[PDB]
Ligand binder design. Sequence first.
Ligand SMILES: Cc1cc2nc3c(=O)[nH]c(=O)nc-3n(C[C@H](O)[C@H](O)[C@H](O)COP(=O)(O)OP(=O)(O)OC[C@H]3O[C@@H](n4cnc5c(N)ncnc54)[C@H](O)[C@@H]3O)c2cc1C
Ligand SMILES: Cc1cc2nc3c(=O)[nH]c(=O)nc-3n(C[C@H](O)[C@H](O)[C@H](O)COP(=O)(O)OP(=O)(O)OC[C@H]3O[C@@H](n4cnc5c(N)ncnc54)[C@H](O)[C@@H]3O)c2cc1C
Ligand SMILES: CCCCCCCCCCCCO[C@@H]1O[C@H](CO)[C@@H](O[C@H]2O[C@H](CO)[C@@H](O)[C@H](O)[C@H]2O)[C@H](O)[C@H]1O
Ligand SMILES: CCCCCCCCCCCCO[C@@H]1O[C@H](CO)[C@@H](O[C@H]2O[C@H](CO)[C@@H](O)[C@H](O)[C@H]2O)[C@H](O)[C@H]1O
Ligand SMILES: [Se]
Ligand SMILES: [Se]
Ligand SMILES: [Se]
Ligand SMILES: [Se]
Lengths: 421, 421
Amino acid sequence: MRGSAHVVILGAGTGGMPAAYEMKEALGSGHEVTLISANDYFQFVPSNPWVGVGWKERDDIAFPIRHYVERKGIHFIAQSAEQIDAEAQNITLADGNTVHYDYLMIATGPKLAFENVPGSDPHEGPVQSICTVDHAERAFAEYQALLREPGPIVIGAMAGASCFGPAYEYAMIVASDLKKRGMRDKIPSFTFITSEPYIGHLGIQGVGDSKGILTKGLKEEGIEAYTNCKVTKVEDNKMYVTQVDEKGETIKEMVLPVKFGMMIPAFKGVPAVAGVEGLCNPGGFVLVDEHQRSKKYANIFAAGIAIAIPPVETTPVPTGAPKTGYMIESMVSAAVHNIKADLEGRKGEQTMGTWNAVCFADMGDRGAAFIALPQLKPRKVDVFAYGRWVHLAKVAFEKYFIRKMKMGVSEPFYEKVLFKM
Amino acid sequence: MRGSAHVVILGAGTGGMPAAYEMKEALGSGHEVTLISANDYFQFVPSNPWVGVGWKERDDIAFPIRHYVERKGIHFIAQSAEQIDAEAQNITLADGNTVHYDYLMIATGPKLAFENVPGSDPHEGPVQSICTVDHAERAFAEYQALLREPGPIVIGAMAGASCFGPAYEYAMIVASDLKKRGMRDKIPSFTFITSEPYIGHLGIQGVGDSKGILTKGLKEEGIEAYTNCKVTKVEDNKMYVTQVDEKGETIKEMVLPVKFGMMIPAFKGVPAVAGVEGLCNPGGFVLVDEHQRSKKYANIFAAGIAIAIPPVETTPVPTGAPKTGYMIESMVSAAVHNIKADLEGRKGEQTMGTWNAVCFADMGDRGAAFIALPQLKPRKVDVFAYGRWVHLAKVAFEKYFIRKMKMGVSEPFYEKVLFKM
Ligand SMILES: Cc1cc2nc3c(=O)[nH]c(=O)nc-3n(C[C@H](O)[C@H](O)[C@H](O)COP(=O)(O)OP(=O)(O)OC[C@H]3O[C@@H](n4cnc5c(N)ncnc54)[C@H](O)[C@@H]3O)c2cc1C
Ligand SMILES: Cc1cc2nc3c(=O)[nH]c(=O)nc-3n(C[C@H](O)[C@H](O)[C@H](O)COP(=O)(O)OP(=O)(O)OC[C@H]3O[C@@H](n4cnc5c(N)ncnc54)[C@H](O)[C@@H]3O)c2cc1C
Ligand SMILES: CCCCCCCCCCCCO[C@@H]1O[C@H](CO)[C@@H](O[C@H]2O[C@H](CO)[C@@H](O)[C@H](O)[C@H]2O)[C@H](O)[C@H]1O
Ligand SMILES: CCCCCCCCCCCCO[C@@H]1O[C@H](CO)[C@@H](O[C@H]2O[C@H](CO)[C@@H](O)[C@H](O)[C@H]2O)[C@H](O)[C@H]1O
Ligand SMILES: [Se]
Ligand SMILES: [Se]
Ligand SMILES: [Se]
Ligand SMILES: [Se]
């Protein structure tokens, strides 16, 4: 309302959850902050691959949201938004109720675009997913079924995927788990299929020696790997794969039987956001300026996977660059600061800063991590590392982030750098 | 003087130069800040290996100090301290003049302990050094002489050394330069000798895959490598080497002819500081608390290589852990802050923070860098990286640090992290 702005945060995930706390903290008692999300629980998504192999359970990585945000003065609506009218500034919820906003922060993350590959939906065939805890649990269930009746394994990433790390991570831990169960030698064939132009491209043109180390890693585990691949369909428990050359021409077609499978899908924007006229690019990603503000609607901001970031390269098979946790947090901080500024006359000048990608993958006793910035080479930092410190860091961070999501966030978030001072 | 403390900084190097600026800036016009150093010029020491192979010249990496510090209100005495009387708080200079202090900040760096190995002094035989620009220039001159009359090369690190990186770096660039000159195949034998327990120990129990990558690097260049070595003497242009086992017992003795050689010597504390009774450990390193304050004299502080840091491991052949630039700067900032606090009643509580080692080595088009913290494993960060970004970073940093040393430093020094924001 006038003089008492109502700020709505859409999506309670890695960007959205902290956004709600930061917003309330920044705006104080004289402004209404409402968090709206499809699920009533928060999930720590980097843990999903471990859930998918049964190394973690849902209870460890997920918790109900209401009490934690409400104790902080935040209103929580555990309902999916179906429609957004940017003109009337109304959001229509699943149950038909409508919510008005003065400012909207879109943090809706990815739509998992299984529709890009007929039969690839986890409910349609043997190709599973580890992007959400629901799917990772389903994946593990199917993993157990492969255990009872061994058959070929196919893990990897679809055309248009932008999140490659987890495919490598899942493939490695499955292998690990298969050995630990003394079941590894029961598998007819274990294949890695990716839209990357080469192993360890990772959607970022490689980082450190990601190419050499991931290649060696896959061979070490007896996983046969194909790059420049797109899946055209999953059908009759078979994956139809087309592999191309540098110029897009076909160099082969394969038909791979699948007993157990997991392909990272392409991400698009969620329908209710992509549905807003003139808001998004053709993929359904919100077009924002450097301040995280919609280019079309001055009172709409966005952060997280939901925003559009222009491609910097064009690969034989369509691929995307990942949007990772540290950058997402910077987007969130910028949005909160700039909205607050709006509510006070100023024009917030804060931006998300330098593009970067930071990923940590835990293999059990040790992990791999990378840091790349900025997006194009030659980079200022281009590091791929492997060791125990990586495992320790992942374990530590999951514990930290989850605690933070329960206890509240002021907050210039990452002072993980107090381990220096 | 009373109410107008006179602060003296001893040594104008990596810690001392910035210390003088920071001190003056922190104390202001009502306190006298005097910088005393053996040379009238500053040198950027990480560039010395390149000078030693002729890739850099003295003019690029060194400049006279006086004008830059004096324009900032700092008094500069280009004289070596010979004696320090901590009781009367008097420093005796080479020319016999004496300087009084209320506070003393010792930043004298290492004494190069060539005396540990008879005949190993750069002026005594073929074993050269790249630790100072004087020596690196001498090293290159001798390198040219090897060029005119090819013979065996021996590069490496002495027993008790603590600075291993530069030995690897020098060995690699010599190889590189030898090839570029089409002279590589003229060398009878190219040997790497180190007191490290294994290749890439680096005095820090290895970091990332330093072991594997440096091993491969040496083999790639046709350099034969021996570890667990100590040199007993250099004589008749021969290096006498004893190699031990895990328990110190001898497993062989070698006599290596040397036409061109470069061994990193052990570091001790400089004589005028080691000469202060009860100030230092047996190596001549200043015993300080976490606030950088001498454990014996409340008005004596120290930073840089000059301080003592206890060993965390004991290697078959004596070795030390390096003290590198970022940690040295933190020591400096802490000392300045705590002295200022003293001069105002408070007890400064600032410390240098977490132990760490950060090294960058440029090979020409690309480099290797590492980051390790804290000192003991398992670490929070344990990274060894190689690439163009390393070269770019080294080149950038040398340019930055040298500019900073001419223009002044407030200053919370490293905001190299504004490349994020
Ligand atoms: C398997 C996997 C592993 C990953 N590992 C890492 C890692 O190790 N490090 C790293 O930095 N990044 C990692 N990421 C990348 C990234 O950081 C995550 O994808 C992260 O969760 C994205 O943050 P987000 O806020 O944009 O989207 P999300 O976390 O997916 O949150 C979006 C939210 O909004 C909701 N929503 C969607 N539509 C609606 C609607 N119409 N109405 C209401 N609510 C809606 C959702 O249900 C959800 O809660 C990983 C991603 C995946 C898939
Ligand atoms: C070859 C080499 C390469 C290195 N490369 C790196 C790198 O890439 N990155 C990194 O972080 N570190 C590097 N280091 C390690 C380290 O950071 C340096 O050694 C650094 O210069 C040490 O800082 P300092 O202030 O303690 O000593 P110094 O820089 O040596 O300064 C000490 C000073 O005090 C003086 N002095 C000594 N005795 C007296 C006296 N009696 N009276 C008056 N003045 C005196 C000196 O002449 C000198 O100016 C390298 C070291 C070497 C030898
Ligand atoms: C974070 C996103 C990236 C993708 C997700 C995960 C990908 C899967 C990991 C593959 C790595 C497997 O391969 C593994 O890597 C390194 C190779 O340098 C080796 O480890 C080697 O370097 C490390 C340090 O970095 C040393 O501590 C080690 O002693 C050395 O052998 C391992 O011996 C090898 O088994
Ligand atoms: C900073 C202190 C450390 C010591 C100082 C300097 C030591 C000398 C450097 C030795 C490195 C030489 O060896 C070199 O290393 C890496 C090995 O992973 C290789 O490079 C490999 O990984 C890099 C990324 O990290 C990739 O970009 C590259 O395509 C790949 O081949 C080089 O092909 C090899 O030639
Ligand atoms: Se990733
Ligand atoms: Se990631
Ligand atoms: Se080093
Ligand atoms: Se270093």
